[PDB]
Amino acid sequence: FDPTELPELLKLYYRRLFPYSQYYRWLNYGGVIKNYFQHREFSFTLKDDIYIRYQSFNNQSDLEKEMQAANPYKIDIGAVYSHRPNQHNTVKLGAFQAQEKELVFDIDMTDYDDVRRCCSSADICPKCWTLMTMAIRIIDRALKEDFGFKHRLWVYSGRRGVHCWVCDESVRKLSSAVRSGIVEYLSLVKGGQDVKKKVHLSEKIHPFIRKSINIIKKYFEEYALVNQDILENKESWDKILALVPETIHDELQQSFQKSHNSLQRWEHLKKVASRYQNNPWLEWEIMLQYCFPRLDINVSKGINHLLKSPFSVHPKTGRISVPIDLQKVDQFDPFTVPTISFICRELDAIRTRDYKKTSLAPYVKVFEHFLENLDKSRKG
Numbered sequence: 276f277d278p279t280e281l282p283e284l285l286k287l288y289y290r291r292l293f294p295y296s297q298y299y300r301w302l303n304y305g306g307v308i309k310n311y312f313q314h315r316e317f318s319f320t321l322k323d324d325i326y327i328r329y330q331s332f333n334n335q336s337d338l339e340k341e342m343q344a345a346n347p348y349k350i351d352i353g354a355v356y357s358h359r360p361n362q363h364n365t366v367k368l369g370a371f372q373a374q375e376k377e378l379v380f381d382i383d384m385t386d387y388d389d390v391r392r393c394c395s396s397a398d399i400c401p402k403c404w405t406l407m408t409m410a411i412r413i414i415d416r417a418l419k420e421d422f423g424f425k426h427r428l429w430v431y432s433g434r435r436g437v438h439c440w441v442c443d444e445s446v447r448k449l450s451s452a453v454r455s456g457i458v459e460y461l462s463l464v465k466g467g468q469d470v471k472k473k474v475h476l477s478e479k480i481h482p483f484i485r486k487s488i489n490i491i492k493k494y495f496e497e498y499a500l501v502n503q504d505i506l507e508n509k510e511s512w513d514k515i516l517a518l519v520p521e522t523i524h525d526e527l528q529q530s531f532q533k534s535h536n537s538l539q540r541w542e543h544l545k546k547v548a549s550r551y552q553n554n555p556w557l558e559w560e561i562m563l564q565y566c567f568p569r570l571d572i573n574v575s576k577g578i579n580h581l582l583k584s585p586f587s588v589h590p591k592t593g594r595i596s597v598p599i600d601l602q603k604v605d606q607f608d609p610f611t612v613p614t615i616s617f618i619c620r621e622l623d624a625i626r627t628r629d630y631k632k633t634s635l636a637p638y639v640k641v642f643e644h645f646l647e648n649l650d651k652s653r654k655g
């Protein structure tokens with residue numbers, strides 16, 4: 276993909292491919308509440324990194340217009356405010372308030388750099404992507420079963436990770452404190468870089484943790500012991516020994532030297548750890564520390580947080596911020612995700628149905644099913 280064709284591709288994409296209809300369907304929420312879409316903040320990042328926020332629009336047409344006119348490189352969605360963001364200059368200090376917004380999560384592969392061996396920073400590969408899969412399943416399960424959130428839209432970030440938009444009516448009215456509490460409930464991996472051991476479990480295991488572990492169990496052998504090979508050599512297995520008491524270090528060190536692969540060594544770790552318990556949950560603390568999601572509280576805490584819009588175009592990979600079908604989550608592949616050049620290619624090889632003829636269609640379908648359930652909930 277070539278980022279210089281981009282300003283030309285954006286023109287076309289924003290004119291004949293970006294699903295404005297479904298977009299407005301989403302953000303207008305069936306018109307039940309007035310000025311909801313009209314009080315929504317957007318922000319655009321234009322060429323040469325020109326950043327503008329407090330963008331608001333009268334309706335879908337105004338949006339189509341200003342977007343096609345600006346042709347932004349980045350689009351971020353924000354809160355629904357007390358007034359129209361456009362007019363924020365006209366509002367007296369103290370009355371311009373973010374009032375409602377979807378509950379959002381940002382999962383970023385870069386946050387796993389201390390426990391994945393294949394890549395670092397913004398690099399991703401099929402061997403580490405399984406981490407997202409566990410993250411989506413682990414978290415979405417909690418949002419659905421523990422919290423009863425019914426309308427959850429998962430979106431590819433374009434390069435390094437995934438977003439979740441929780442859009443239930445009661446959720447959009449959640450205070451920053453409750454949001455922060457939901458993040459604290461979901462969070463198990465605590466610490467920065469000074470701290471080598473980021474997971475400590477109590478004698479009693481809360482169901483969320485149990486159900487998260489059981490999801491990780493299903494993936495751990497292939498992800499961690501085979502593909503990542505976290506016990507390949509001493510440099511790697513010392514990092515794991517750093518997460519367990521010193522009194523079992525020597526025993527494990529020898530059993531690791533005498534062993535041939537990570538499966539054997541993990542199986543040894545299990546037996547020694549289990550034996551350590553009798554006279555605690557080391558295995559699970561290690562699995563969690565190596566596979567459980569890391570969550571930035573600042574992303575989900577603030578009602579005024581601006582997050583990458585679905586169907587944005589990634590300035591470098593060219594990939595589309597596409598919705599993720601929760602039913603096929605294990606089959607999701609960020610490397611076969613449509614790029615803008617590909618869907619413009621498809622378009623220039625054939626009115627409101629042009630995108631259906633592109634590879635963009637099934638993701639818009641996922642988005643439409645997300646919208647349909649959203650209507651049904653408003654009705655009954």
Ligand SMILES: [Zn+2]
Nearest residue numbers: 393394400403
């Ligand atoms: Zn990788």
